[PDB]
Design a protein around this nucleic acid. Sequence first.
RNA 1: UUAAUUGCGAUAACGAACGAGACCUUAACCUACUAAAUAGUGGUGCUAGCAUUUGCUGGUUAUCCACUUCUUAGAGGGACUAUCGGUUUCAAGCCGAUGGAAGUUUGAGGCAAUAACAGGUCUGUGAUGCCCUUAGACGUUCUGGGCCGCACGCGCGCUACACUGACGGAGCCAGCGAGUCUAACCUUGGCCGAGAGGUCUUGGUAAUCUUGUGAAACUCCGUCGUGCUGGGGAUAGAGCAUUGUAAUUAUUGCUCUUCAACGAGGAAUUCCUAGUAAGCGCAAGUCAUCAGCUUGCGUUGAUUACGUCCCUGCCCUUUGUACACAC
Lengths: 141, 80, 69, 67, 206, 63, 145, 141, 107
Amino acid sequence: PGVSVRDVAAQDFINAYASFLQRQGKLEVPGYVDIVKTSSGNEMPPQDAEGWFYKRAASVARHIYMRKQVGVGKLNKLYGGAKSRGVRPYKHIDASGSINRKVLQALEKIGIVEISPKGGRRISENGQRDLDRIAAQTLEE
Amino acid sequence: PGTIVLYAERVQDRGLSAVAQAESMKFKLLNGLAIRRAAYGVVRYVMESGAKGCEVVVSGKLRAARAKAMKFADGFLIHS
Amino acid sequence: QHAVILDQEKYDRILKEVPTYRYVSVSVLVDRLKIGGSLARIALRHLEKEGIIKPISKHSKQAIYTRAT
Amino acid sequence: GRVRTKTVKRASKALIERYYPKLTLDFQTNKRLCDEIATIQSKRLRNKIAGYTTHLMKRIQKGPVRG
Amino acid sequence: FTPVVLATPIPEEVQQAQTEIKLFNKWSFEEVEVKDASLVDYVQVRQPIFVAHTAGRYANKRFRKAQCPIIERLTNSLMMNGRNNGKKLKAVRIIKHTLDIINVLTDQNPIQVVVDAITNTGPREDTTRVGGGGAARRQAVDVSPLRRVNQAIALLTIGAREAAFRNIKTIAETLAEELINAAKGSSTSYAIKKKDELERVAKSNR
Amino acid sequence: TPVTLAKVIKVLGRTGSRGGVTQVRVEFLEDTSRTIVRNVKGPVRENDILVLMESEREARRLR
Amino acid sequence: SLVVQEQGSFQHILRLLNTNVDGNIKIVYALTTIKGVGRRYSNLVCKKADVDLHKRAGELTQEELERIVQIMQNPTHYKIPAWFLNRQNDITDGKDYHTLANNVESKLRDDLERLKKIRAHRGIRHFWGLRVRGQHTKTTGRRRA
Amino acid sequence: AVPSVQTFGKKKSATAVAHVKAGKGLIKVNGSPITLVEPEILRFKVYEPLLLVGLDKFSNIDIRVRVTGGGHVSQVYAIRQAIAKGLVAYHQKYVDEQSKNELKKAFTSYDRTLLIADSRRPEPKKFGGKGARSRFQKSYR
Amino acid sequence: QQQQIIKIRITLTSTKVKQLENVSSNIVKNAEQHNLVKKGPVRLPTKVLKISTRKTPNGEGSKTWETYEMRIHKRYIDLEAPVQIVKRITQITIEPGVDVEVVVASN
RNA sequence: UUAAUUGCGAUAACGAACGAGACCUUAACCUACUAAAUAGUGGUGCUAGCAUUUGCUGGUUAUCCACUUCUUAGAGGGACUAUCGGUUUCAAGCCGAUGGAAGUUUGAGGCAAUAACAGGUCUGUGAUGCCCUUAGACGUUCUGGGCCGCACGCGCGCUACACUGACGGAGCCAGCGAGUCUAACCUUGGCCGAGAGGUCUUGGUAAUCUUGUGAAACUCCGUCGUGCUGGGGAUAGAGCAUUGUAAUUAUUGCUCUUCAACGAGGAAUUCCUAGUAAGCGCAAGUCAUCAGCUUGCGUUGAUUACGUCCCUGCCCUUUGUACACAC
Ligand SMILES: [Mg+2]
Ligand SMILES: [Mg+2]
Ligand SMILES: [Mg+2]
Ligand SMILES: [Mg+2]
Ligand SMILES: [Mg+2]
Ligand SMILES: [Mg+2]
Ligand SMILES: [Mg+2]
Ligand SMILES: [Mg+2]
Ligand SMILES: [Mg+2]
Ligand SMILES: [Mg+2]
Ligand SMILES: [Mg+2]
Ligand SMILES: [Mg+2]
Ligand SMILES: [Mg+2]
Ligand SMILES: [Mg+2]
């Protein structure tokens, strides 16, 4: 009967948690959404102009839940991709630090992640309220 | 001072040392001994010291403007 | 050269021609009709909504549909 | 690609010459007995010598081998 | 046939596969007999695979690739033209879609359809240059069953690739109508046209 | 067009300027004891069944 | 995550900043035919105008299109952060402008003779028709410019 | 304590370690159910050891697998080899020998890789080319 | 001073594995007949120092490369021994080519 | 017959040496040995957070016990083409099947004979003969410039011509490395900034910390929809930064804008046979800064042939020679 965020596929968990955050309406979206690219290696802003921050927040919350400690630099590398350098070959580029830092601060303000004494951010007790309840509801539907 | 100390010890089986033989070959050539005479001397001294084989190559110009090489070998020598 | 905007004539043609298609996909709707790929993706979802087309494989980059039942 | 050099062939030839009764048709005991009747500087060379000795013993079981 | 319950729930559709190994989960390797003799034992069925990805060693020996399942040989010939080298996951997805599209058409088994296409489009007589250079001749020869299977897959996939290039039709479908047309025998397929050309040159150069 | 089916008994050797052909001896599956020698282009071995557009033609490129 | 239908109240090619903007192209990419308007700029302008991003540019009303033009012409007035513009810190007045269709050619021309009348090296290279960003001219650019 | 075996499976650089103890049907990979293994199109590669012998003989077993190294394809092959070898090793130690032989024959009938690691290793690159065999392009003029 | 635990770690580094394993054997043996509680010699992964160079002093020729290697072998042993006697036995007989580092812990 | 002057044989030769092989290094196997808080695992002294009632996990090794499967590396073992069959002058060997971690010299390399080339290097050398110069210097240093200069001809390459795709979001996995107190090297984390970057601390002289180098290709869900198009990204403008004494002839990075050729390439031509080709990135060298280069490394992983002497080249035998500065 016990369900954690490991019995649920990644994509359909992030979709459902991002939808939960959107209808909950306390994620504190910074405001410079709709202009930023999420990476200097990108060249277009997210196509889901209104929900991409919530996807990113749910993805980061799940990532913290699976791991022990994650900082912004870890998230920047994780969400970084290849950059088309034009006439030059491709190369890995880290994602936007400010977006990842503000996502983490938002989840702190909501209570999903914590100060993590030996590093960056760590999953919270309420963090594993919400992620587990979401995982249960996604599995039983 | 004192943290470094220098000792010397004698090279047992001198005739089996390539560096020693090359230095003696150099000195005899510098003094003026004929290339063949010095080279054969090193060859048979190394043979007399119990070596399995010896080989002495001398390359350069030898009383001629053109430069050539000459080998002096004796015994058993492997390569690979 | 292709219909990116749906009008009543093409919509009625879609409702009459997509039925009696053994195989329906984006490319079939773009070719056999004259709608564009974006309209075809909207149409495939929409025709699934009432069910005049049945889904077989659901994949990005390839949808496979067939006649209902 | 598996032609044996004269060093293997000669060693196996001599081994059969002076140790035929001690030898068998089994490579495992043939290499275990090459360890004691011969001094070979390599395990791989010993395996080859015992393998060609076993091969020549198998040939010897059906008519003599020339030489 | 009977549900067995494990702590990790194994779905019903993957639990059905105990009784019979199919392709991805649908196509049975039974009733896929090669009608065209001389291609049996060079078109490999009768050992079912769940998926066309088996990282097998079929290159060490000469005829070892004859034992590779014919769907996997189709996938390997797909992941081709440079930008697709490697990318077997992509080619396995194309083949899964291709077989679905074949069964949506032509309700008969898509494994059977691809086998028919292989049999139908392998040239039975070809030519070879004799003489050192252009000032030479072309002499006709017969084609081994392995080369017939090889060249059949080559012609089918090359035609599907060229059809899919620069048009709305995806690679899975262009391969599906290429296989269906080659299976029937239509001369509107690339592979049938090329095979007919090869045999025609061979008979003209006997 | 009535093509014929034969089975390879022996692989004679490799002919052609560049060696790309293989000479084989084949026997007829239908109306057996009918044995001929053919030239084959692809990889071939014994027991291979090979389909001949015409039967009456002996292989001429040998050695 | 949703998909919705649409209705055909449509207009074909429409004038916009003395530029023929083709209908049947989604609005963000239709506006890119105007010089000075790129994909980033068009997407942000549409988001600022609250224009739906999936309207095909022939199904926008006149008031939406004039709102779009109003934003493209005065981006700073609608919170476009000025690191997003054609001409930041303009050389002759210091204000941040985003150049549009015909002004793009014009003020490129101004950048040209300004360097050419001070006889700067970049202006001289432009006058001779050579590369201006330090490329090697031994083996490339041999079929044009 | 509880009967248990610990086996491993190895593709090129991927190693899956499988702990197989007495249980009631757990089959977990990196803490997640076997049903969630990626890439999705290779799911039946890790189903094969389960389906080739029947699911009735995973009914009293807990299998937990951890895979590291290699890539997304190799990790799947290491996982399926670990599960197959773990089932055989568990039956070797705690079930009778006939059962171990029949499992071993069933696995080997389908794929030798299920129990024997593929021995193909990368060939070291050589100077004068981009690969082990390929050379730089020469021009002669 | 009198039969006191020291929490010592002896780290052995070298490029010559034979003599490195002789010194390791000597340490383990001297712990053995002196009845120590010791953590066996832990062998750290070998470090391969690679230097890749062109063979030609000039630039002419086929582009042939050399990869010179230096192999560094590292071991360490943990002992709990009285300081005086092990200091006397381990300060002496330091074989050449092996660098010995002896460090005290407060764990 | 072999990869081999590797062998079996033939035999006015017999028995030998070098080279080849052996050897060495590396890759693959070891639930068998030795051990590990700088590797990992299971219990739990001690807990602890859950959803639940055991599934997922966070923590301490005189804030525990145990162990070595996975990792590491010492000592060893293991393959010898084994067994069986076929074939061969029934020999050397070759072929198939079985077994096996492994059966292409097990894979790849390191070393590697004799005789030479007027091959390259005096611009690596405090290697060096001879010649030249040596104070208005051809020594050395400083400032500036050039080495990059552009009607054009050729070679190695990068990026592409798109839907087997681009783009957006999500999933998300390597191996080889390197790294500072013998001074600022590798940098986690926090904060700020769209970004590049900045800033305050941290750990690491390193199986410890960067670093699980969360790499890219790839996977999935979407947007686009055959349009030089949301392919391609040259050229160019404006601006923000970083390295450096110094960036103009733009060091490099970032942002917005400009948005060329290019629609698969002629005669010709290169590389390649299995974890190979190809695709994809990463580390290292260089390095203050700069890679579209090289050296390695892994990730994904084909098709085709296991051959011949047609082309090219090389070797051998017979032969002709007026060649031997050897066509
Ligand atoms: Mg297409
Ligand atoms: Mg030798
Ligand atoms: Mg050798
Ligand atoms: Mg072990
Ligand atoms: Mg010279
Ligand atoms: Mg230069
Ligand atoms: Mg790693
Ligand atoms: Mg364009
Ligand atoms: Mg583009
Ligand atoms: Mg831009
Ligand atoms: Mg420079
Ligand atoms: Mg260079
Ligand atoms: Mg050539
Ligand atoms: Mg004559």
